[PDB]
Every structure is written in C-alpha cells, then in structure tokens.
Design a protein around this ligand. Structure first.
Ligand SMILES: Cc1cc2nc3c(=O)[nH]c(=O)nc-3n(C[C@H](O)[C@H](O)[C@H](O)COP(=O)(O)O)c2cc1C
Ligand SMILES: Cc1cc2nc3c(=O)[nH]c(=O)nc-3n(C[C@H](O)[C@H](O)[C@H](O)COP(=O)(O)O)c2cc1C
Lengths: 176, 175
C-alpha cells in the first residue's frame, strides 16, 4: 500500500453514513466492483453463505419501499439486499454464522462503495418477512441487511457529529 | 491515492495467516487495530462491543483450552470481541450483536493487514469456557477472536484462494 496511506485517517474516518442522494446514475463498473468486494469477502469455512439481490430498476425499488418506515429510505438509487443462507452457513451452538458472514460481505461492499466515491447507509430497520414475501425469498434464506447506495448530495452534511465511546471504555487488557 | 485499488491492492493481498514468527507486535500497531474497532459503525451507533486483548503469557495459556485447532496456541496476540446483548440494537426476538461485532472485527482484520500483520478470524472456540475463564458477564458473549502477529513469510496460505463466481452469488431485481 502507498507509503503515506493510513487506513484509519484516509479511508475509515472519511466515511460517514449518507442518506440523501443526487440523481447521478451509478456507473455499471462501480456497481460491479461493489459486488466483487462482497464476493471476495472471507466467511467461516469459506462457505460464502450469502446471496446479493440487487434492486435498482424502478419497479423493484417501488416494491422494496414498503419494507421501511424511515423517510429517507425510498430516496436511494440502488439497494443491495444481502441474503443469508442458513442451510449453507457454518453451525455453532444452536445457531449459525449467517449474521457474522453476511456482515463481513456487507462491510466489504460498504467500504468498496466508499472507495469509489459513493455514499451509502447500512440498513437493518426493515420488515424482513415482507421483503421475503415480495421477492419470493426461500424460507431457508433471510434478508439480513440492505446496503442503500448512490452518489451523495454534497449539500447535506452528516446527520450528526461523529461520536464513539473512548478507547478506555471499549478496551481491556488481559482481564475485564 | 491515484491508482490504489481497494480490491486488487488491499483486499486480495490478504489471506488468513495461522503461522507466526517471534517478532513482537509494536504497541502503536496494536493500538491502531483497536482504534479501527472503536470507530466502526454499528446499528443505531450503540457500539455493543468490548475488546479483550490477551497477549501476556498467563492469559494466552488460559485461553488455549478454548480452541481445539493445532495452530491456535501459536498466535502472539488475541483480541476477543465481546458482544453486549443489552446494549445492541433489537430486531424481532434477536439483536445486532453478531452483525455489529463482525463490523468491528472486519475493521480490525483490515487494519492489521494495512500494518503488515497477519491474522485469522476465529469463531471455532469454546464460548462457554471462555466466559468462565474470563469472568464475562452473562449478558455479554465472546463472539469472535482475532488471532494476530507477524506471519511466517515462508508459509503459504492454507489453500489456494477460491470463491463462487459472480453469477452464482448475484441476482438482479429477482432471484
Ligand atoms: C466468521 C469467520 C470465522 C472463521 N473461523 C475460523 C476458525 O475458527 N479457525 C480457522 O482456522 N479459520 C477460521 N476462519 C478463517 C477462514 O477459514 C477463511 O477466512 C476462509 O477460508 C477464507 O480464506 P482467506 O481468509 O485466506 O481468504 C474464519 C473466518 C471467518 C470470516
Ligand atoms: C448494522 C447496521 C445497521 C444500521 N441500520 C440503519 C438503519 O436501519 N437506518 C439508518 O438510517 N441507519 C442505519 N445504520 C447507520 C448507522 O446509523 C451509522 O452507521 C452510525 O450512526 C454511525 O455513523 P457513521 O456511519 O456516519 O459513522 C446502520 C448501521 C449498521 C452498522
């Protein structure tokens, strides 16, 4: 990687959630890169227990809209619905790695979108069963998360000032 | 940077590393990894995680029985990512602990990679024993462990890189 490139300052910290978008169409090659990032993500046992359902045509976007009650949601040009396949995900305890593995793919895709100058927001506040009904999703697959993305409106600042807990609050060394 | 590509030049150069050399991990590098976790996004920004670092001999030895994999006791540093079910955002009968802790884990895995370190994401460990050993409160779960250090450059990846094709994993508009 470049000599002076810092992942934190130059890349992670420059990404804020974007909920307000302009009309500029997203280039095909940029959408394909985002999807490639998801495809190459690691997973437990490399089972890749995900499927990416892209919704960007008007009919599909309109169908998806009723799954959310957040006013900003229907304004996103592109949605990537990340489906987790319980039949394919590694088992642990009485559950599985669907939430873990899909979230790695979502993180890769979010970061890839950011690297290509797009804005996005990760969405989990939606009616999953309704999503499954509308898109004929098999019972054994769950829509876990949706990446809502497009070109951000540059006149709209981040929703609030950046805030996180202190490093002293979130880290313990050796013992809690 | 001009022709720095996140996929070709960063994601694809990372493979899981399970075999490590003795070189100590610099404090500044460990702190950067933890900073990457801290600044990760999370549902409702609730940040329902806690990072338990285990790198001293007593701790590393105490943790070892939680893993059955031969390579695991070779890792110099473990970051045990705890998820807090009380604080995590709620959906249906569940919560975002596995989602959120995994975003933080991904940020830390990627940070380690950017700093010249090797690591492996570990979920195959005895979570109940881990909770007992480290007195983890009942409302918190150890979800994942990032095992990290300087990789042995003489050891290749465990297997050749393989993923499903793009056509297998993507559908446009309908399944
Ligand atoms: C959620 C998750 C859990 C994993 N758990 C383990 C583990 O317990 N032990 C192990 O040896 N590898 C584990 N891995 C590493 C995977 O085997 C590895 O990421 C996968 O085979 C893809 O290979 P790559 O990381 O080299 O691209 C885990 C990876 C993920 C993402
Ligand atoms: C797992 C997850 C689910 C999220 N769900 C939503 C959502 O349903 N609606 C929304 O407006 N924002 C959602 N967010 C965006 C968060 O509000 C945002 O990431 C957080 O406040 C931190 O802000 P930042 O992303 O600008 O750093 C979600 C984020 C994550 C990581």
């Amino acid at each position: 990687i470049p000599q002076d490139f810092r992942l934190i300052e130059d890349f992670f910290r420059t990404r804020r959630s974007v909920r307000k978008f302009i009309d500029r169409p997203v280039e095909e090659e940029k959408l394909m890169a985002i999807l490639e990032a998801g495809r190459i993500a690691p997973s437990a046992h490399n089972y890749q227990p995900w499927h990416f359902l892209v919704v960007r045509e008007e009919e599909g976007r309109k169908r998806l809209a009723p799954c959310s009650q957040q006013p900003w949601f229907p304004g996103a040009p592109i949605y990537i619905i990340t489906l987790g396949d319980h039949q394919r995900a590694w088992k642990r305890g009485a559950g599985d790695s669907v939430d873990i593995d899909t979230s790695i793919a979502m993180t890769y895709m979010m970061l890839e979108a950011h690297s290509l100058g797009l804005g996005c927001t990760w969405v989990c506040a939606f009616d999953q069963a309704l999503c499954s009904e509308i898109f004929d999703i098999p019972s054994h697959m769950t829509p876990v998360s949706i990446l809502a993305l497009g070109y951000g409106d540059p006149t709209v600042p981040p929703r609030e000032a950046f805030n996180r807990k202190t490093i002293e609050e979130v880290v313990s060394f050796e013992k809690l």
